């Protein structure tokens, strides 16, 4: 379980990581099967008992898209990549935008309700769920660009289209 309160350089804390144990379980042991998937995740680092959570996912077993479920298997990478992108800048060891790091949890919690439709990809996909970040992005961009000017509006609009581009592994 990828849960820790310590938001590091390479980690961005969002929410319960139901997305993580999906590629291996839906490939090797259990595969696609009609039923409910109960996940229990006890996050730990040596003797540090971090957090325990559980989740229930509905499932029918409507095939399995390989690369999309693999992309879904690590959402924390794309979330950290979106957090690390600065307002204006090119350096890579910066904290990026820390105000985004407080609105990623709510959008992740809103996404995690329809986790079955996310996983089987009936009408929910990466593009359809990451547009739930839109209103939080607008109202964070209002804070980060608190000017009523043309350039502030254009840079706010560039802040709007920020979304977690998926990655292959």
């Amino acid at each position: 379980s990828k849960i820790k309160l310590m938001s590091n350089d390479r980690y961005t804390f969002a929410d319960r990581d139901w997305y993580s144990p999906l590629f291996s379980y839906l490939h090797a042991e259990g595969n696609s099967r009609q039923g409910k998937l109960w996940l229990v995740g006890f996050a730990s680092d040596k003797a540090k008992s971090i957090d325990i959570w559980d989740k229930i996912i509905e499932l029918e077993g409507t095939d399995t898209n390989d690369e999309l479920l693999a992309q879904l298997a690590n959402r924390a990478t794309a979330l950290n990549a979106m957090r690390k992108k600065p307002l204006r800048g090119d350096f890579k060891k910066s904290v990026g935008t820390p105000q985004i790091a407080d609105i990623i949890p709510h959008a992740e919690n809103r996404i995690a309700i329809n986790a079955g439709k996310m996983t089987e990809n009936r009408g929910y996909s990466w593009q359809d769920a990451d547009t739930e970040y839109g209103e939080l992005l607008t109202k964070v961009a209002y804070s980060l660009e608190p000017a009523q000017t043309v350039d502030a509006r254009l840079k706010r609009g560039n802040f709007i289209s920020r979304k977690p581009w998926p990655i292959i592994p």
Partner: protein, 165 residues
Amino acid sequence: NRGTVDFIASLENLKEGDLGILRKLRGARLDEKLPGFDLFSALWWPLRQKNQRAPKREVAWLIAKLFAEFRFEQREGATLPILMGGICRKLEPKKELPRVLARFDQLASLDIMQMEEPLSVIMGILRKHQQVCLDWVGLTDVLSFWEQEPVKREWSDSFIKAYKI
């Protein structure tokens, strides 16, 4: 809105010498020259008495001086961030366009008593491109309403939508 359209009409009915004494008064206040104050009284006091929605003193003085300087006709649907902003599509986007954009950007950070000079250079850019019409009524009721944030917001994204066509 009443009180503003008749103000624009009376400004447009002003003759050449009156516009000249307004032109010479540009750049300073109206406490150092008599005929500027007499003209402001003549063009304000009866229209202030007749209507409750008369514009505020300093914005009316600013628009009077700017109309004397530039003399563009009143036409509906020809506000500043449409005309400039359509002008901002024909420039070089990497160097010249950011500079004219910063010239228009400066306008959002002045009070009412130094505002006439950045407006003057913006209207000079307008005059260099043969622009005959300006929404004078629109400019003055959005300038008298300058105390709020939504008015500058709709100003700005009007410039944006004029830019994206």
